[PDB]
Amino acid sequence: XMKXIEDKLXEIXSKXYHXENXLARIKXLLXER
Amino acid sequence: XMKXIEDKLXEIXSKXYHXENXLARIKXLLXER
Amino acid sequence: XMKXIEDKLXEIXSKXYHXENXLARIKXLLXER
Amino acid sequence: XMKXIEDKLXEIXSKXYHXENXLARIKXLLXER
Protein backbone atom coordinates (compact mmCIF):
# COMPACT_ATOMS: atom_id res chain seq x y z
CA UNK A 1 0.00 0.00 0.00
CA MET A 2 1.20 3.33 1.35
CA LYS A 3 4.76 2.25 2.25
CA UNK A 4 4.55 0.15 -1.96
CA ILE A 5 3.96 3.70 -3.19
CA GLU A 6 6.57 5.56 -1.09
CA ASP A 7 9.28 2.92 -1.46
CA LYS A 8 8.16 3.07 -6.07
CA LEU A 9 8.70 6.81 -5.41
CA UNK A 10 12.83 4.96 -3.96
CA GLU A 11 12.90 3.53 -7.43
CA ILE A 12 11.93 6.69 -9.34
CA UNK A 13 14.01 9.12 -7.35
CA SER A 14 17.11 5.63 -8.79
CA LYS A 15 15.77 6.46 -12.27
CA UNK A 16 15.89 10.21 -11.94
CA TYR A 17 20.29 9.02 -10.94
CA HIS A 18 20.06 7.00 -14.16
CA UNK A 19 18.65 11.46 -15.56
CA GLU A 20 22.05 12.38 -14.07
CA ASN A 21 24.03 9.70 -15.84
CA UNK A 22 21.46 11.04 -19.54
CA LEU A 23 23.37 14.27 -18.83
CA ALA A 24 26.84 12.99 -17.89
CA ARG A 25 26.09 10.77 -21.88
CA ILE A 26 25.28 14.24 -23.23
CA LYS A 27 28.14 16.16 -21.51
CA UNK A 28 30.51 12.68 -23.50
CA LEU A 29 28.99 14.13 -26.65
CA LEU A 30 29.43 17.79 -25.85
CA UNK A 31 33.37 17.39 -23.14
CA GLU A 32 31.50 19.96 -21.00
CA ARG A 33 31.42 20.66 -17.25
CA UNK B 1 -7.79 5.48 -5.98
CA MET B 2 -4.93 3.76 -4.19
CA LYS B 3 -4.54 0.81 -6.60
CA UNK B 4 -4.99 4.19 -9.86
CA ILE B 5 -1.90 5.60 -8.16
CA GLU B 6 0.13 2.37 -7.70
CA ASP B 7 -0.74 0.92 -11.10
CA LYS B 8 0.40 5.22 -12.73
CA LEU B 9 3.54 4.46 -10.65
CA UNK B 10 3.37 0.71 -13.57
CA GLU B 11 3.35 3.35 -16.25
CA ILE B 12 6.17 5.52 -14.88
CA UNK B 13 8.47 2.73 -13.82
CA SER B 14 7.42 1.84 -18.51
CA LYS B 15 8.67 5.42 -19.02
CA UNK B 16 11.73 5.17 -16.85
CA TYR B 17 12.38 1.63 -19.81
CA HIS B 18 11.65 4.24 -22.49
CA UNK B 19 15.20 6.32 -19.84
CA GLU B 20 16.98 3.06 -20.73
CA ASN B 21 16.22 3.15 -24.43
CA UNK B 22 17.41 7.68 -24.00
CA LEU B 23 20.72 6.01 -23.05
CA ALA B 24 20.90 3.08 -25.50
CA ARG B 25 20.02 6.62 -28.35
CA ILE B 26 22.99 8.26 -26.62
CA LYS B 27 25.30 5.19 -26.49
CA UNK B 28 24.11 5.18 -30.99
CA LEU B 29 25.68 8.62 -30.87
CA LEU B 30 28.66 7.82 -28.71
CA UNK B 31 29.19 3.23 -30.03
CA GLU B 32 29.79 2.79 -26.27
CA ARG B 33 29.10 -0.08 -23.85
CA UNK C 1 -4.75 15.14 -1.10
CA MET C 2 -5.49 11.92 -2.94
CA LYS C 3 -6.97 13.49 -6.11
CA UNK C 4 -3.29 16.40 -5.67
CA ILE C 5 -1.30 13.18 -5.97
CA GLU C 6 -3.23 11.48 -8.82
CA ASP C 7 -3.71 14.64 -10.87
CA LYS C 8 0.92 15.32 -10.08
CA LEU C 9 1.01 11.72 -11.42
CA UNK C 10 -1.23 14.02 -14.93
CA GLU C 11 1.84 16.18 -14.87
CA ILE C 12 4.45 13.41 -14.76
CA UNK C 13 2.81 11.08 -17.22
CA SER C 14 3.14 15.38 -19.52
CA LYS C 15 6.85 15.10 -18.61
CA UNK C 16 7.30 11.48 -19.56
CA TYR C 17 5.61 13.31 -23.51
CA HIS C 18 8.34 15.92 -23.01
CA UNK C 19 10.78 11.70 -22.74
CA GLU C 20 9.16 11.20 -26.16
CA ASN C 21 10.11 14.57 -27.58
CA UNK C 22 14.27 13.60 -25.61
CA LEU C 23 14.05 10.76 -28.16
CA ALA C 24 12.50 12.49 -31.18
CA ARG C 25 15.99 15.36 -30.18
CA ILE C 26 18.11 12.20 -30.26
CA LYS C 27 16.54 10.58 -33.38
CA UNK C 28 17.49 14.84 -35.00
CA LEU C 29 21.01 13.86 -34.04
CA LEU C 30 20.96 10.29 -35.25
CA UNK C 31 17.82 10.88 -38.83
CA GLU C 32 16.48 7.55 -37.47
CA ARG C 33 12.99 6.01 -37.34
CA UNK D 1 3.05 9.66 4.88
CA MET D 2 0.64 11.49 2.60
CA LYS D 3 2.32 14.93 2.75
CA UNK D 4 6.25 12.36 2.23
CA ILE D 5 4.56 11.28 -1.00
CA GLU D 6 3.22 14.67 -2.21
CA ASP D 7 6.31 16.65 -1.23
CA LYS D 8 8.68 13.16 -3.42
CA LEU D 9 6.16 14.07 -6.17
CA UNK D 10 8.23 18.27 -5.32
CA GLU D 11 11.39 16.36 -6.06
CA ILE D 12 10.21 14.58 -9.22
CA UNK D 13 8.35 17.47 -10.75
CA SER D 14 12.83 19.17 -9.80
CA LYS D 15 13.95 16.14 -11.86
CA UNK D 16 11.46 16.52 -14.65
CA TYR D 17 13.52 20.70 -14.64
CA HIS D 18 16.75 18.68 -14.69
CA UNK D 19 14.24 16.84 -18.45
CA GLU D 20 14.23 20.52 -19.50
CA ASN D 21 17.92 21.12 -18.99
CA UNK D 22 18.32 16.96 -21.15
CA LEU D 23 16.70 19.02 -23.93
CA ALA D 24 18.45 22.40 -23.58
CA ARG D 25 22.06 19.51 -23.70
CA ILE D 26 20.40 18.18 -26.86
CA LYS D 27 19.39 21.55 -28.40
CA UNK D 28 23.88 22.33 -27.51
CA LEU D 29 24.32 19.36 -29.81
CA LEU D 30 21.73 20.26 -32.39
CA UNK D 31 22.00 25.03 -31.94
CA GLU D 32 18.19 24.72 -32.20
CA ARG D 33 15.30 26.75 -30.74
mmCIF file with all atom_site columns, C-alpha atoms in Angstrom:
data_model
loop_
_atom_site.group_PDB
_atom_site.id
_atom_site.type_symbol
_atom_site.label_atom_id
_atom_site.label_alt_id
_atom_site.label_comp_id
_atom_site.label_asym_id
_atom_site.label_entity_id
_atom_site.label_seq_id
_atom_site.pdbx_PDB_ins_code
_atom_site.Cartn_x
_atom_site.Cartn_y
_atom_site.Cartn_z
_atom_site.occupancy
_atom_site.B_iso_or_equiv
_atom_site.pdbx_formal_charge
_atom_site.auth_seq_id
_atom_site.auth_comp_id
_atom_site.auth_asym_id
_atom_site.auth_atom_id
_atom_site.pdbx_PDB_model_num
ATOM 1   C CA . UNK A 1 1  ? 0.000  0.000  0.000   1.00 0.00 ? 1  UNK A CA 1
ATOM 2   C CA . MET A 1 2  ? 1.196  3.329  1.345   1.00 0.00 ? 2  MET A CA 1
ATOM 3   C CA . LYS A 1 3  ? 4.762  2.249  2.252   1.00 0.00 ? 3  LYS A CA 1
ATOM 4   C CA . UNK A 1 4  ? 4.551  0.150  -1.965  1.00 0.00 ? 4  UNK A CA 1
ATOM 5   C CA . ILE A 1 5  ? 3.959  3.696  -3.190  1.00 0.00 ? 5  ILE A CA 1
ATOM 6   C CA . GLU A 1 6  ? 6.574  5.564  -1.088  1.00 0.00 ? 6  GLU A CA 1
ATOM 7   C CA . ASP A 1 7  ? 9.279  2.918  -1.461  1.00 0.00 ? 7  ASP A CA 1
ATOM 8   C CA . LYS A 1 8  ? 8.160  3.071  -6.070  1.00 0.00 ? 8  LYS A CA 1
ATOM 9   C CA . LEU A 1 9  ? 8.697  6.813  -5.408  1.00 0.00 ? 9  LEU A CA 1
ATOM 10  C CA . UNK A 1 10 ? 12.834 4.962  -3.958  1.00 0.00 ? 10 UNK A CA 1
ATOM 11  C CA . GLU A 1 11 ? 12.899 3.532  -7.435  1.00 0.00 ? 11 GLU A CA 1
ATOM 12  C CA . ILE A 1 12 ? 11.932 6.690  -9.336  1.00 0.00 ? 12 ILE A CA 1
ATOM 13  C CA . UNK A 1 13 ? 14.012 9.125  -7.348  1.00 0.00 ? 13 UNK A CA 1
ATOM 14  C CA . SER A 1 14 ? 17.111 5.627  -8.786  1.00 0.00 ? 14 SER A CA 1
ATOM 15  C CA . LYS A 1 15 ? 15.768 6.464  -12.275 1.00 0.00 ? 15 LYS A CA 1
ATOM 16  C CA . UNK A 1 16 ? 15.891 10.215 -11.936 1.00 0.00 ? 16 UNK A CA 1
ATOM 17  C CA . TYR A 1 17 ? 20.292 9.023  -10.942 1.00 0.00 ? 17 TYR A CA 1
ATOM 18  C CA . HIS A 1 18 ? 20.061 6.998  -14.163 1.00 0.00 ? 18 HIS A CA 1
ATOM 19  C CA . UNK A 1 19 ? 18.654 11.464 -15.557 1.00 0.00 ? 19 UNK A CA 1
ATOM 20  C CA . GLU A 1 20 ? 22.051 12.379 -14.065 1.00 0.00 ? 20 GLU A CA 1
ATOM 21  C CA . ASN A 1 21 ? 24.033 9.695  -15.841 1.00 0.00 ? 21 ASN A CA 1
ATOM 22  C CA . UNK A 1 22 ? 21.465 11.036 -19.543 1.00 0.00 ? 22 UNK A CA 1
ATOM 23  C CA . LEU A 1 23 ? 23.372 14.271 -18.832 1.00 0.00 ? 23 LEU A CA 1
ATOM 24  C CA . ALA A 1 24 ? 26.844 12.994 -17.893 1.00 0.00 ? 24 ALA A CA 1
ATOM 25  C CA . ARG A 1 25 ? 26.091 10.770 -21.882 1.00 0.00 ? 25 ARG A CA 1
ATOM 26  C CA . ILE A 1 26 ? 25.284 14.239 -23.226 1.00 0.00 ? 26 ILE A CA 1
ATOM 27  C CA . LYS A 1 27 ? 28.145 16.157 -21.515 1.00 0.00 ? 27 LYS A CA 1
ATOM 28  C CA . UNK A 1 28 ? 30.509 12.677 -23.501 1.00 0.00 ? 28 UNK A CA 1
ATOM 29  C CA . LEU A 1 29 ? 28.991 14.131 -26.647 1.00 0.00 ? 29 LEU A CA 1
ATOM 30  C CA . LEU A 1 30 ? 29.431 17.788 -25.850 1.00 0.00 ? 30 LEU A CA 1
ATOM 31  C CA . UNK A 1 31 ? 33.371 17.387 -23.137 1.00 0.00 ? 31 UNK A CA 1
ATOM 32  C CA . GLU A 1 32 ? 31.497 19.956 -21.002 1.00 0.00 ? 32 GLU A CA 1
ATOM 33  C CA . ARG A 1 33 ? 31.416 20.659 -17.251 1.00 0.00 ? 33 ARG A CA 1
ATOM 34  C CA . UNK B 1 1  ? -7.793 5.477  -5.981  1.00 0.00 ? 1  UNK B CA 1
ATOM 35  C CA . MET B 1 2  ? -4.932 3.762  -4.193  1.00 0.00 ? 2  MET B CA 1
ATOM 36  C CA . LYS B 1 3  ? -4.537 0.806  -6.604  1.00 0.00 ? 3  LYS B CA 1
ATOM 37  C CA . UNK B 1 4  ? -4.990 4.185  -9.861  1.00 0.00 ? 4  UNK B CA 1
ATOM 38  C CA . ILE B 1 5  ? -1.900 5.599  -8.164  1.00 0.00 ? 5  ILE B CA 1
ATOM 39  C CA . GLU B 1 6  ? 0.130  2.373  -7.698  1.00 0.00 ? 6  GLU B CA 1
ATOM 40  C CA . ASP B 1 7  ? -0.741 0.917  -11.100 1.00 0.00 ? 7  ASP B CA 1
ATOM 41  C CA . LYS B 1 8  ? 0.404  5.222  -12.733 1.00 0.00 ? 8  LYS B CA 1
ATOM 42  C CA . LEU B 1 9  ? 3.539  4.462  -10.655 1.00 0.00 ? 9  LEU B CA 1
ATOM 43  C CA . UNK B 1 10 ? 3.369  0.707  -13.573 1.00 0.00 ? 10 UNK B CA 1
ATOM 44  C CA . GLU B 1 11 ? 3.353  3.352  -16.246 1.00 0.00 ? 11 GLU B CA 1
ATOM 45  C CA . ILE B 1 12 ? 6.175  5.518  -14.879 1.00 0.00 ? 12 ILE B CA 1
ATOM 46  C CA . UNK B 1 13 ? 8.475  2.728  -13.815 1.00 0.00 ? 13 UNK B CA 1
ATOM 47  C CA . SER B 1 14 ? 7.422  1.837  -18.506 1.00 0.00 ? 14 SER B CA 1
ATOM 48  C CA . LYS B 1 15 ? 8.667  5.424  -19.024 1.00 0.00 ? 15 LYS B CA 1
ATOM 49  C CA . UNK B 1 16 ? 11.731 5.175  -16.845 1.00 0.00 ? 16 UNK B CA 1
ATOM 50  C CA . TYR B 1 17 ? 12.378 1.628  -19.809 1.00 0.00 ? 17 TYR B CA 1
ATOM 51  C CA . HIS B 1 18 ? 11.650 4.242  -22.486 1.00 0.00 ? 18 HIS B CA 1
ATOM 52  C CA . UNK B 1 19 ? 15.196 6.318  -19.844 1.00 0.00 ? 19 UNK B CA 1
ATOM 53  C CA . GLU B 1 20 ? 16.984 3.059  -20.731 1.00 0.00 ? 20 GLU B CA 1
ATOM 54  C CA . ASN B 1 21 ? 16.220 3.148  -24.432 1.00 0.00 ? 21 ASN B CA 1
ATOM 55  C CA . UNK B 1 22 ? 17.407 7.675  -23.996 1.00 0.00 ? 22 UNK B CA 1
ATOM 56  C CA . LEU B 1 23 ? 20.716 6.012  -23.053 1.00 0.00 ? 23 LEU B CA 1
ATOM 57  C CA . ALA B 1 24 ? 20.896 3.085  -25.495 1.00 0.00 ? 24 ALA B CA 1
ATOM 58  C CA . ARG B 1 25 ? 20.022 6.619  -28.354 1.00 0.00 ? 25 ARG B CA 1
ATOM 59  C CA . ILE B 1 26 ? 22.990 8.258  -26.623 1.00 0.00 ? 26 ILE B CA 1
ATOM 60  C CA . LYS B 1 27 ? 25.300 5.186  -26.494 1.00 0.00 ? 27 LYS B CA 1
ATOM 61  C CA . UNK B 1 28 ? 24.115 5.183  -30.993 1.00 0.00 ? 28 UNK B CA 1
ATOM 62  C CA . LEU B 1 29 ? 25.682 8.624  -30.874 1.00 0.00 ? 29 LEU B CA 1
ATOM 63  C CA . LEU B 1 30 ? 28.659 7.817  -28.709 1.00 0.00 ? 30 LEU B CA 1
ATOM 64  C CA . UNK B 1 31 ? 29.192 3.232  -30.029 1.00 0.00 ? 31 UNK B CA 1
ATOM 65  C CA . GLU B 1 32 ? 29.790 2.792  -26.272 1.00 0.00 ? 32 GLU B CA 1
ATOM 66  C CA . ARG B 1 33 ? 29.103 -0.075 -23.846 1.00 0.00 ? 33 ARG B CA 1
ATOM 67  C CA . UNK C 1 1  ? -4.748 15.141 -1.098  1.00 0.00 ? 1  UNK C CA 1
ATOM 68  C CA . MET C 1 2  ? -5.485 11.920 -2.943  1.00 0.00 ? 2  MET C CA 1
ATOM 69  C CA . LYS C 1 3  ? -6.975 13.487 -6.110  1.00 0.00 ? 3  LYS C CA 1
ATOM 70  C CA . UNK C 1 4  ? -3.293 16.401 -5.669  1.00 0.00 ? 4  UNK C CA 1
ATOM 71  C CA . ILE C 1 5  ? -1.296 13.184 -5.973  1.00 0.00 ? 5  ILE C CA 1
ATOM 72  C CA . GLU C 1 6  ? -3.227 11.476 -8.820  1.00 0.00 ? 6  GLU C CA 1
ATOM 73  C CA . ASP C 1 7  ? -3.707 14.644 -10.867 1.00 0.00 ? 7  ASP C CA 1
ATOM 74  C CA . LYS C 1 8  ? 0.924  15.315 -10.080 1.00 0.00 ? 8  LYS C CA 1
ATOM 75  C CA . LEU C 1 9  ? 1.007  11.719 -11.417 1.00 0.00 ? 9  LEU C CA 1
ATOM 76  C CA . UNK C 1 10 ? -1.232 14.016 -14.932 1.00 0.00 ? 10 UNK C CA 1
ATOM 77  C CA . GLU C 1 11 ? 1.840  16.181 -14.869 1.00 0.00 ? 11 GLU C CA 1
ATOM 78  C CA . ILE C 1 12 ? 4.453  13.409 -14.760 1.00 0.00 ? 12 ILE C CA 1
ATOM 79  C CA . UNK C 1 13 ? 2.809  11.077 -17.222 1.00 0.00 ? 13 UNK C CA 1
ATOM 80  C CA . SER C 1 14 ? 3.142  15.380 -19.520 1.00 0.00 ? 14 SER C CA 1
ATOM 81  C CA . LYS C 1 15 ? 6.852  15.098 -18.606 1.00 0.00 ? 15 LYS C CA 1
ATOM 82  C CA . UNK C 1 16 ? 7.296  11.480 -19.561 1.00 0.00 ? 16 UNK C CA 1
ATOM 83  C CA . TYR C 1 17 ? 5.610  13.309 -23.510 1.00 0.00 ? 17 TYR C CA 1
ATOM 84  C CA . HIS C 1 18 ? 8.341  15.920 -23.009 1.00 0.00 ? 18 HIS C CA 1
ATOM 85  C CA . UNK C 1 19 ? 10.781 11.697 -22.740 1.00 0.00 ? 19 UNK C CA 1
ATOM 86  C CA . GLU C 1 20 ? 9.161  11.198 -26.165 1.00 0.00 ? 20 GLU C CA 1
ATOM 87  C CA . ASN C 1 21 ? 10.112 14.571 -27.582 1.00 0.00 ? 21 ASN C CA 1
ATOM 88  C CA . UNK C 1 22 ? 14.265 13.602 -25.605 1.00 0.00 ? 22 UNK C CA 1
ATOM 89  C CA . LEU C 1 23 ? 14.049 10.764 -28.155 1.00 0.00 ? 23 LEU C CA 1
ATOM 90  C CA . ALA C 1 24 ? 12.498 12.491 -31.185 1.00 0.00 ? 24 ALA C CA 1
ATOM 91  C CA . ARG C 1 25 ? 15.989 15.358 -30.176 1.00 0.00 ? 25 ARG C CA 1
ATOM 92  C CA . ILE C 1 26 ? 18.108 12.197 -30.260 1.00 0.00 ? 26 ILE C CA 1
ATOM 93  C CA . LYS C 1 27 ? 16.542 10.582 -33.379 1.00 0.00 ? 27 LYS C CA 1
ATOM 94  C CA . UNK C 1 28 ? 17.490 14.839 -34.998 1.00 0.00 ? 28 UNK C CA 1
ATOM 95  C CA . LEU C 1 29 ? 21.014 13.856 -34.036 1.00 0.00 ? 29 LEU C CA 1
ATOM 96  C CA . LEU C 1 30 ? 20.959 10.289 -35.251 1.00 0.00 ? 30 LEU C CA 1
ATOM 97  C CA . UNK C 1 31 ? 17.818 10.877 -38.833 1.00 0.00 ? 31 UNK C CA 1
ATOM 98  C CA . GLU C 1 32 ? 16.481 7.555  -37.474 1.00 0.00 ? 32 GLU C CA 1
ATOM 99  C CA . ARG C 1 33 ? 12.991 6.015  -37.339 1.00 0.00 ? 33 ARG C CA 1
ATOM 100 C CA . UNK D 1 1  ? 3.046  9.664  4.882   1.00 0.00 ? 1  UNK D CA 1
ATOM 101 C CA . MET D 1 2  ? 0.643  11.487 2.595   1.00 0.00 ? 2  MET D CA 1
ATOM 102 C CA . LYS D 1 3  ? 2.325  14.930 2.746   1.00 0.00 ? 3  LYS D CA 1
ATOM 103 C CA . UNK D 1 4  ? 6.247  12.365 2.228   1.00 0.00 ? 4  UNK D CA 1
ATOM 104 C CA . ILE D 1 5  ? 4.563  11.281 -0.999  1.00 0.00 ? 5  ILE D CA 1
ATOM 105 C CA . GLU D 1 6  ? 3.218  14.667 -2.210  1.00 0.00 ? 6  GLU D CA 1
ATOM 106 C CA . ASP D 1 7  ? 6.312  16.646 -1.228  1.00 0.00 ? 7  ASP D CA 1
ATOM 107 C CA . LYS D 1 8  ? 8.680  13.164 -3.417  1.00 0.00 ? 8  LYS D CA 1
ATOM 108 C CA . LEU D 1 9  ? 6.165  14.070 -6.171  1.00 0.00 ? 9  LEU D CA 1
ATOM 109 C CA . UNK D 1 10 ? 8.233  18.270 -5.317  1.00 0.00 ? 10 UNK D CA 1
ATOM 110 C CA . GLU D 1 11 ? 11.386 16.361 -6.059  1.00 0.00 ? 11 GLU D CA 1
ATOM 111 C CA . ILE D 1 12 ? 10.211 14.581 -9.217  1.00 0.00 ? 12 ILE D CA 1
ATOM 112 C CA . UNK D 1 13 ? 8.346  17.473 -10.755 1.00 0.00 ? 13 UNK D CA 1
ATOM 113 C CA . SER D 1 14 ? 12.831 19.169 -9.799  1.00 0.00 ? 14 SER D CA 1
ATOM 114 C CA . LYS D 1 15 ? 13.953 16.138 -11.857 1.00 0.00 ? 15 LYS D CA 1
ATOM 115 C CA . UNK D 1 16 ? 11.456 16.520 -14.652 1.00 0.00 ? 16 UNK D CA 1
ATOM 116 C CA . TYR D 1 17 ? 13.524 20.704 -14.643 1.00 0.00 ? 17 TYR D CA 1
ATOM 117 C CA . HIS D 1 18 ? 16.752 18.676 -14.687 1.00 0.00 ? 18 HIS D CA 1
ATOM 118 C CA . UNK D 1 19 ? 14.239 16.843 -18.453 1.00 0.00 ? 19 UNK D CA 1
ATOM 119 C CA . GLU D 1 20 ? 14.228 20.519 -19.499 1.00 0.00 ? 20 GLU D CA 1
ATOM 120 C CA . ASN D 1 21 ? 17.925 21.118 -18.991 1.00 0.00 ? 21 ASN D CA 1
ATOM 121 C CA . UNK D 1 22 ? 18.323 16.962 -21.152 1.00 0.00 ? 22 UNK D CA 1
ATOM 122 C CA . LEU D 1 23 ? 16.705 19.022 -23.935 1.00 0.00 ? 23 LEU D CA 1
ATOM 123 C CA . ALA D 1 24 ? 18.446 22.400 -23.582 1.00 0.00 ? 24 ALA D CA 1
ATOM 124 C CA . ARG D 1 25 ? 22.058 19.509 -23.704 1.00 0.00 ? 25 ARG D CA 1
ATOM 125 C CA . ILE D 1 26 ? 20.402 18.177 -26.863 1.00 0.00 ? 26 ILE D CA 1
ATOM 126 C CA . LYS D 1 27 ? 19.386 21.553 -28.400 1.00 0.00 ? 27 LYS D CA 1
ATOM 127 C CA . UNK D 1 28 ? 23.885 22.334 -27.507 1.00 0.00 ? 28 UNK D CA 1
ATOM 128 C CA . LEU D 1 29 ? 24.323 19.363 -29.808 1.00 0.00 ? 29 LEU D CA 1
ATOM 129 C CA . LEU D 1 30 ? 21.732 20.260 -32.392 1.00 0.00 ? 30 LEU D CA 1
ATOM 130 C CA . UNK D 1 31 ? 21.997 25.032 -31.941 1.00 0.00 ? 31 UNK D CA 1
ATOM 131 C CA . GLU D 1 32 ? 18.188 24.720 -32.205 1.00 0.00 ? 32 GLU D CA 1
ATOM 132 C CA . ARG D 1 33 ? 15.304 26.749 -30.743 1.00 0.00 ? 33 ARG D CA 1
#
